[PDB]
Structure formats: structure tokens, C-alpha cells
Design a protein around this ligand. Sequence first.
Ligand code: ZN
Ligand code: ZN
Length: 70
Amino acid sequence: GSSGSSGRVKQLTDEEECCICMDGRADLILPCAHSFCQKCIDKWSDRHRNCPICRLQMTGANESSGPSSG
Ligand SMILES: [Zn+2]
Ligand SMILES: [Zn+2]
């Protein structure tokens, strides 16, 4: 009713934020709706322009590319 400690108006200043950890802000953003902060980006040795999320292709769409022997 007329009680409660938490539960007040919260400014929407924030606009974007990492997707992996989602701390508060995002260092960069991808054209596929995927952002990553310095922390994470740095963590992932292979920080190639390539997108990690998409790369996974988890229940995405029919796209044949091919494995990587290396
Ligand atoms: Zn992050
Ligand atoms: Zn992506």
C-alpha cells in the first residue's frame, strides 16, 4: 500500500550496455545488436571483428559456412 523502502522513479539515462556481463555501459556495439565492454572484449583472446554471439549460431537460421581445421 503506502509503504516500501525500494521502488521509486528511476532515470533512464543509460542507453546501452554490454551483453555478456551487462555491467552498466558498453564499450562498443555491433550491427547485429550485440555490445561488449572492454573487460569482456579483452578477456576473449580472439577479439577479431567477428562476433562471438552470432558465431555460435544457436537456433539461428539455415547458414552453411564450414568448420575450421587450423
Ligand atoms: Zn562485458
Ligand atoms: Zn552478433
